[PDB]
Design a protein around this ligand. Structure first.
Ligand SMILES: [Mg+2]
Length: 212
């Protein structure tokens, strides 16, 4: 059910309706629809279409910026809804690779983690690999999970360096590492030496738990 409001949410993103997206999130929300379904069956569906349109040179950067802001505004209404049911499996240090400012997915995963029994340490975006290493050092010995984002190949490559720097500082084996984004493949995860990855907030939370 709810297909109509899903399409409206999907279209609000596709048509750069920044002001409207929030209203619809409330409309759907008030209709007893779960925040995560609003994202995965509506907003995310639209963001994907907008992604294809761009890669096909149909739309451009002015449209992508507005679709981005459209979803960020939507997240301001759903995040609090997601932080409910705060079901401490450990400490998660979240960040987006250096030179990368894409934070929608990063913010979504960080919200789920924590909502699923995790203490959060959000480093923000454009985080240097050393500041992540410095953060991991301050928490050496305890239950630590490094959650990293990167939506650009150029920034995703730096994840290798990160893993390499964690070893040079013999800090690795004491922490679990999960990278994500999209340019991140199940191949690249082992090429460097990570412990996992997810494709969405939902799975991210599950994998985070399983990886103990
Ligand atoms: Mg810089």
């Amino acid at each position: 059910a709810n297909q109509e409001i899903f399409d409206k949410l999907r279209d609000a993103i596709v048509n750069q309706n920044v002001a409207g997206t929030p209203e619809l999130c409330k409309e759907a929300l008030a209709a007893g629809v779960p925040a995560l379904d609003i994202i995965t069956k509506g907003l995310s569906v639209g963001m994907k279409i907008v992604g294809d349109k761009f890669e096909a040179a149909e739309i451009f950067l002015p449209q992508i910026m507005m679709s981005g802001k459209a979803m960020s505004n939507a997240m301001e209404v759903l995040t609090p809804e997601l932080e409910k049911n705060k079901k401490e499996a450990g400490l998660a240090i979240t960040f987006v690779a250096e030179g990368d400012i894409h934070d929608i997915g990063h913010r979504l995963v960080t919200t789920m983690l924590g909502a699923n029994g995790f203490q959060i340490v959000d480093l923000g975006v454009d985080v240097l690999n050393e500041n992540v290493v410095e953060e991991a050092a301050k928490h050496k010995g305890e239950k630590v999970l490094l959650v990293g984002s990167a939506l650009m190949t150029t920034s995703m490559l730096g994840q290798k360096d990160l893993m390499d720097r964690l070893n040079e500082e013999k800090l690795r084996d004491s922490v679990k590492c999960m990278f994500g984004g999209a340019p991140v493949s199940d191949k690249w995860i082992e090429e460097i030496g990570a412990d996992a990855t997810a494709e969405n907030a939902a799975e991210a939370a599950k994998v985070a738990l399983e990886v103990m």
